[model samples]
Target: NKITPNLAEFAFSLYRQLAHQSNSTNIFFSPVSIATAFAMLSLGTKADTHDEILEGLNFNLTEIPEAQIHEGFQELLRTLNQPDSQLQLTTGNGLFLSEGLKLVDKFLEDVKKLYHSEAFTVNFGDTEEAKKQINDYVEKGTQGKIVDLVKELDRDTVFALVNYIFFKGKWERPFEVKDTEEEDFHVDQVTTVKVPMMKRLGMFNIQHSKKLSSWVLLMKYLGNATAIFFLPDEGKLQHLENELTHDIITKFLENEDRRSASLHLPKLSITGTYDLKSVLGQLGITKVFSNGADLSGVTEEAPLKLSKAVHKAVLTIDEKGTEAAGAMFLEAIPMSIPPEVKFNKPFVFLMIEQNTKSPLFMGKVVNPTQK
Candidate 1:
């Protein structure tokens, strides 16, 4: 057995790229859940080594199973101090084939067959029906809201998933929706217009104007991580957008290590998406694309190359501790929910791990003003 650090790093880099490209703040329900799943399947030939690697990280991969994989992912939510979580998973023919690769196709065949199979077509033909089945399964799995996830994974072979978690409790002081008026949203120098914004006062990571254009407000999830939203001065939001980069994000997250402080923020929601492959290529994960990649261990043949990974996610912030991460993964293809009370608008949101300060997702909305 062997541990594929490069592979893990590649996946991690891919994750980071997905994080940045997704317009909404997103969080992985169980980093270990996902890591273990991919590792288990990918490390089939070198499982022993992978196990050693996992042990080194204090994460156990052996314990993960199809039966328990969903459970493990669900368990990550409980770790949240004011915990709230939801999730979903789906796969088209692609994922179905991945699961069955060990049984179909011969060794002499293209090893990539492990990633792509005639089975993929079978899976796709039934995916429409499968999605309905998966939806029902998730609804049952989450017991209503704990794991609200949806997946429409279209791929040749996939290990797809969907996860959504939102916690919007009231601040000791609540914001009145009546006070939310049409405010000017500065999209760019060329665009400025009125949009409804939710007003609020609460405990947040407040920043003075020196940081950038607007007052930056930070939201912490379970205390291990924080998401900082830079609100431009009336119409300067585009400045932060233009200047945002990996370094900028790293620096901003580094700043979150400070003690918690108070912040007054408007309620808000935002949406975004981007091609993950290009983003990962930019994030220094060239090995994933390099021939040296080792997902080969995932199957008897070495046909799988992690051809693609896509993430569609959402994040939101409110008074209830900040429920801030949700995402979908499509191996060949990709493809959730909630209700609570008191979801005000015009706020910025972020989902960060309580300890490493890792971000799951982040977004800003001057207005969730759509009917």
Candidate 2:
């Protein structure tokens, strides 16, 4: 399917908007995972609500029919969840509905077939217990990296959806564990902190962009995955971040073709959680949260509105490889000495599937020791 290009573009747009809203804090979230959850929600919406959902996802309703869109997601999810000996990537989605509310049979079946999401009937009146159940599901789906994803639940919530992703992969060119040492990482021009940085010398796809004043590095995993790191020149982090777009990413991927080089990166472990209701609303998805929401496709028997949409994600980088998971619920090359590129400063990076180029995880590392 040709959906990957669209999905990748949308992922970049989502990342750009998210980065802008998040400001300087470490940013990380699964674009495909979040988009998949929303796609499931779109199935149960109608009229303007449905159209809004698709448009918010960067899809034009007139160009791509709803069924075809679902087909695209199916292909994407299937490809992502494909078994790999060298990569550990798993995703799970769930639809937790109030016990009294009845979902249309067709809607349930479609979600199951397209998203492989499980259905659960919980009593929203028991808000704490419902929250516990939802959190437990997310915890398990994310391999326990994320706990208590649903911090609080609304008693009036008739429908709550969640999606979880857990990924772990060993680097194709592994970093030496013994060589890792405590080093200083520049938080900014004036601030600095000590962090355990991993060092290695190997062949890597590296490119330097004078236009962006950044070095683009593509570090591969053992299987079908890679982490692309963008280290902006001193004091250029904000400028490069603001200019983030699909075209820029395309340029980076194109110009920074893979090659051999020396790489130095810090051992990183970062986690992020987001309340997407407001973010989505800001992106023109206000109807689903309002009382006038039209979700008849889910249940004509009872009016339904989205009550909670929360997401939590975690990413860990070590000498062995990277372990990154996300639950949506809602480059420089040089000569001489192999051109050492140390990520001892602020930078933005992405964890993407190598096969289809689907963005699985995206983030910025400001302070590696903070979290």
Candidate 3:
């Protein structure tokens, strides 16, 4: 509970950080994936380096002890990976250590037990081979949704950290294929493109957030998880972005009202790639990447500072199924002829496990047609 709130805060902050630099491009990412990886990486570090990693992730060490933080991740992953769960969602972490490096035994053990990740000894000198092995693990781990995740590798790298999340959930009420049709999607006031908009008329929970000046709608998956859409009024995106936060979102989650209405969404198939080295640098987490960093827990024989950090994700939603950001909605309803609402413009989508309250992913659909 405490963990998710912190993580959700981190998700939004990281998102705003990326969106601040991006012009109009789509921003998408898995916050939990990146957080979990860095948390695991923290175990291999000591003193200031370790504390900074967790603290930079929006976790307050003063409030949440270090051991409790790891326990939260362990429990969170277990709940998601439960065999009986309807959603086909799985997230994992990995570490590719350079060959001949002697890592501490507890560091390896704790990573496996806490993060559910495996350690691989790969020859960094052989870049191509290392790429194949790392990509192969992620490719299979994500049900082939993510492939060639590592296109380029740093031969000087001492260790490469990876985190991947894959999700596929059927709609509680499937959108009839016949209802999908070509429609106009406004990119801005001037530019518009045609796209296939999937339409569904069903009972839904919707609200209007005056604070955000956006319409909020909750589209439930077959399970308790949901894909929340926030559609800002035309030309009001900048305002909406500035107003959004974890507390505001929690209010929306609790205060939504249910009614019958029609919802329109684009058929989404998109991918996002981010160089996390620079991404976290924006947050002032620079020590881990520095040469004289204190990662004494990993290996005392050689001071091991992280060389590269990258995060990539893929997502899709069709009549059949779905799959999977660097960076990273509204509506109302009526009676007889239910009110028709559409995300014909750019909208923000946040996917979260309703119970865990942990954000699985967040993205902006500025141009669904572009992806």
Candidate 4:
């Protein structure tokens, strides 16, 4: 429970860093899925290798015990995978190993016991077959939300980790299909594009932050999950990105008051892919990518090092609600007088576990048409 906040903060920090570094106009990724994969990987690490990864994940080694960290994630996963829940969310992790590579017994045991990860032996020497199998598993696990997650696999690739998360949930108050229509979405001051905008009038948790110069809105999904949005004022998009933090989200939630609101949000479908090796390195996770990398726990025979850490994700919003999924191979508010809000411009958004406030996904849509 205590670690949930830490995880959430790490997710945000990763997102913020990725957002700044990403080349795409629209950005999105599954932080939880990525973190899960890394957490599982941490089990096979030791000394500096283990501690470095944990620190990169926003954990202070001196303060928290490693077993408790794994336990926290176990509890979180169990909670998310609860049966009879209204939300249709599936999170899966897997490891594709080279045919000749043998994983250490303790490492293999710990990964399965703690992360429930599946392991498969593959011949990375046969790149085509290996790629197909890895991508196929990822695509199937995510229910086809992601395809060809690994475009190519190198012959030197000894092992690869893949993680996926699929979510399909209805809005507590769904928008009417009839209320959706073509609307102009502002790409910027000089450009605009037509988009199918969804409209609804309902009670929502919303707040206007003068400090952020943004409108924060929290809309509920049927399964007690929420989509928190940050729509910056005309020119404040960069400002919000600069100040992104878990505290900002907490403040937004704290300041928001529920009231009737007329909201017009664009129906969007988007996909994104990221090569996380460089990003992870820039975030001070350098040891895993180096020649001296000590991944002794993974295998005692060969010194294993991280070759590729790729992540791909997709999201869709419609009248039926949100159907979002991601595969990694590797908002608002307001008032009694009927406050009107239109998400016609660039905005940042996140889907979170309502109770723990943990972000499942984070994104920024600058041009919905480009997704």
Q: Write the per-residue lDDT of candidate 1 for residues 168-256, one digit (tens) a residue.
A: 33322334445665555444445555555555433334554444465555544333455556555544444554444444444565563
lDDT of 1 at 202: 32
For residues 123-223, write the lDDT of model 2, one tens digit per residue. Answer: 88889889999998887777677787787777688778776666656776677788999988998888789899899766677888787789888877877
Where does candidate 4 clash, by residue pair? 161-330, 206-333, 217-331, 217-332, 218-331, 218-332, 229-331
Q: Score candidate 4 by lDDT.
A: 0.78
Clashes of each: 43, 9, 13, 7
- lDDT of each prediction vs. the true structure? 0.39, 0.78, 0.81, 0.78
TM-score for candidate 3, residues paired by index: 0.93
1-371 per-residue lDDT for model 3 (tens digits): 66988898889888989898885888888988888888888888888888778888998888888777888887777777677887767667778889889888988888887667888888998889988999999988887788888888876887887777766667765677889999999998897899999998777887767898898888778665888899998778889888888888787778656877778888888777888878887876778888867888888788788886778877777664633201012334454777678989999989888887788899888898786
- On residues 143-249, what C-alpha lDDT tens digit does candidate 4 reach at each position? 77888888766668877776666666677767778899999999888888999999988777877778778888887787858888889998998887777777777
**Alpha carbon lDDT at 43, candidate 4:** 79
Worst 10 residues of 4 by lDDT: 324-333
Candidate no. 4 TM-score: 0.91
- Give the runs in model 2 whose Cα sits over 4 Å from its true position: 251-260, 322-336
Clashing pairs in 2: 203-260, 205-258, 205-259, 215-331, 216-331, 216-332, 217-331, 309-330, 310-330
TM-score of each: 0.49, 0.91, 0.93, 0.91
